Amino acid sequence: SKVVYVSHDGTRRELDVADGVSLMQAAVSNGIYDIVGDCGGSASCATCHVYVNEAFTDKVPAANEREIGMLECVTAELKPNSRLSCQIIMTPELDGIVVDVPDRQW
């Protein structure tokens, strides 16, 4: 699928996230996520907290409590679609997803 990542600083990236990848994984390989070593592509991170555009946040799978605190590690007023770069998976239909890292600290 077509996925696009936006850094909370205002940078954007667009990768190809097929079936079995996560918004992070693709970007990850692309270095988009040169963060720390928590999720390692398994949704165990406190820094990949990101906001998916409401359009791909409703199609994506339902994130579990593991995507709530991990993702809420940084007080970013967790939205309804917020999620750590490594928790949503991309299907061959949900393509065109736009991600964004929360600058909620501003």
Query: Which residues sit at the interface with Ga ion, rule CB under 5 A?
Result: 39, 45, 48, 84-86
What is the SS3 assignment for 53? coil
35 burial class (0-12, 13-18, 19+ CB within 10 angstroms)? middle
Q: Residue 72 is encoded by which pair of tokens?
A: 């809420």
39 is in an annotated binding site: yes
Q: How far is the CB of 72 from Ga ion (least distance, A)?
A: 14
Q: How far is the CB of 61 from Ga ion (least distance, A)?
A: 16
| CA–CA gap between residue 95 and residue 75 (Å, rounded) | 29
User: Which of the 8 DSSP states describes residue 34?
Assistant: -
How wide is the angle at C-alpha 38 spanned by C-alphas 11 and 62, nearest 5°?
A: 75
Q: How far is the CB of 90 from Ga ion (least distance, A)?
A: 15
45 is in an annotated binding site: yes
Smaller CB separation from Ga ion, 9 or 93: 9
Smaller CB separation from Ga ion, 84 or 98: 84
73 is in an annotated binding site: no
Smaller CB separation from Ga ion, 6 or 86: 86
Residues annotated in the binding site for [2Fe-2S] cluster, as ranges?
39, 45, 48, 86
